[PDB]
Amino acid sequence: PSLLKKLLLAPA
Amino acid sequence: SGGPNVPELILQLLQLEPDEDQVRARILGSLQEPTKSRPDQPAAFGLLCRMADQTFISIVDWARRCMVFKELEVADQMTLLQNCWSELLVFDHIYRQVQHGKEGSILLVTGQEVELTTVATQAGSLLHSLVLRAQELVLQLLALQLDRQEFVCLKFIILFSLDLKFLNNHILVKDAQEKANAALLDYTLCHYPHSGDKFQQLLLCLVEVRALSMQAKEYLYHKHLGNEMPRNNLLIEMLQAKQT
Numbered sequence: 001p002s003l004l005k006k007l008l009l010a011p012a
Numbered sequence: 013s014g015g016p017n018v019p020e021l022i023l024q025l026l027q028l029e030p031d032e033d034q035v036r037a038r039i040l041g042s043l044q045e046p047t048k049s050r051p052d053q054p055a056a057f058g059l060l061c062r063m064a065d066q067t068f069i070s071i072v073d074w075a076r077r078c079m080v081f082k083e084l085e086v087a088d089q090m091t092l093l094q095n096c097w098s099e100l101l102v103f104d105h106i107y108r109q110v111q112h113g114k115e116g117s118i119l120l121v122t123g124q125e126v127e128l129t130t131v132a133t134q135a136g137s138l139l140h141s142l143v144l145r146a147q148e149l150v151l152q153l154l155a156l157q158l159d160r161q162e163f164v165c166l167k168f169i170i171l172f173s174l175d176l177k178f179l180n181n182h183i184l185v186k187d188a189q190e191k192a193n194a195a196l197l198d199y200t201l202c203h204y205p206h207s208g209d210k211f212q213q214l215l216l217c218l219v220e221v222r223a224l225s226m227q228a229k230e231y232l233y234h235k236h237l238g239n240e241m242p243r244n245n246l247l248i249e250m251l252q253a254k255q256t
C-alpha cells in the first residue's frame with residue numbers, strides 16, 4: 001500500500 | 013580523536029555505514045532515468061526531489077541493517093522512520109557539509125556544488141533561510157570537532173528519539189535509547205581533549221536539527237499545496253503519514 005512498507009519488506 | 017576504547021555500539025555502527033562512492037553512483041544512476049518533465053517547472057526541481065528521495069532510500073537501507081531496529085516488527089519500524097525521516101535527511105546534509113566543506117558553497121549527495129550566492133539570488137526566502145540555518149549548525153559541529161564516531165551514534169539516537177508509548181516493543185526500544193546515550197557519553201568523556209560538555213553540546217545540536225527539520229517539512233508542505241511536487245514522491249508520503 002505504501003512505498004515505505006514496500007521498502008522495508010524488500011528482500012535484499 | 014580515534015579510539016583505543018570505543019563503545020561496541022559505535023564500532024558496529026561504523027561497519028554498517030554505507031560507502032559514499034557507491035551511494036553517489038546509485039543515486040546518479042537513478043537520476044539518469046527518463047522522466048515526464050512538466051513544462052511549468054524547471055527540470056532541476058524534479059531532479060532534486062528525486063535526489064532527496066533516493067537519499068532517503070539509502071537511509072532506510074541503513075536503518076534496516078541496524079542493531080535492535082532489525083529485531084523490530086514492520087509496524088514499529090515504520091513508526092520510527094515516519095517520526096525521524098526529515099531529521100535523518102537534514103543531518104545527512106549537515107554532516108556532508110562537515111566532511112567536505114567550503115564555506116562558500118554546499119555539497120549535494122550527487123557531488124555537485126552550489127554556491128550560496130546562487131541560493132541567495134535564485135531560491136525563495138524560505139529555502140534560503142533553511143540553507144543558511146543549516147550552515148550555522150555545520151559551523152558549530154566543526155567548532156565542536158564532530159567526528160565519524162559521534163556522527164553514527166547521533167544518527168542512531170535520532171532513529172530512536174521517540175516517546176515509547178507510540179511503539180509496541182517498549183523494552184527493546186527503551187534499552188536502545190539508553191545504550192545510545194551511554195555510548196555517546198562514554199566516547200565524548202574519553203576523547204574530548206577540550207573543555208565543555210561535548211555530550212550535552214551535541215544533544216543541543218540535535219534540538220536544532222529537529223527544529224531545522226520541522227521547517228523543511230513546512231517547505232515541503234508549501235510545495236505540496238501548490239501542486240509543485242512530483243506524483244508518488246516518497247518524501248510527501250512520509251510527510252502525509254499520521255503524526256505520532
Ligand SMILES: CCCCCCCCCCCCCCCC(=O)OC[C@@H](COP(=O)(O)O[C@H]1[C@H](O)[C@@H](OP(=O)(O)O)[C@H](OP(=O)(O)O)[C@@H](OP(=O)(O)O)[C@H]1O)OC(=O)CCCCCCCCCCCCCCC
Pocket residue numbers: 056057060061064097098099101102105120126130131132134135136137138139140142143146224228229231232
Ligand atoms: C527533509 C529535508 C531533506 C533535504 C536533504 C537534501 C538537501 C538538498 C538541498 C537542495 C538545494 C538546491 C539548491 C539549488 C540552487 C537554487 O537556489 O535553486 C532555487 C531553488 C528553487 O527555489 P524555491 O524552492 O525556493 O521556490 C521558489 C519560491 O517558492 C518562490 O516563492 P516566494 O517568492 O514566495 O519565496 C517562488 O516565487 P514566486 O512566489 O514569485 O512564484 C519561485 O517561483 P518562480 O520560479 O516562478 O519565481 C520559486 O522558484 O531550488 C530548488 O528547486 C530546490 C528544491 C529541492 C527539493 C529537495 C527536497 C528538500 C526539501 C527541504 C529543503 C532542504 C533544506 C536544507 C536542509 C536543512
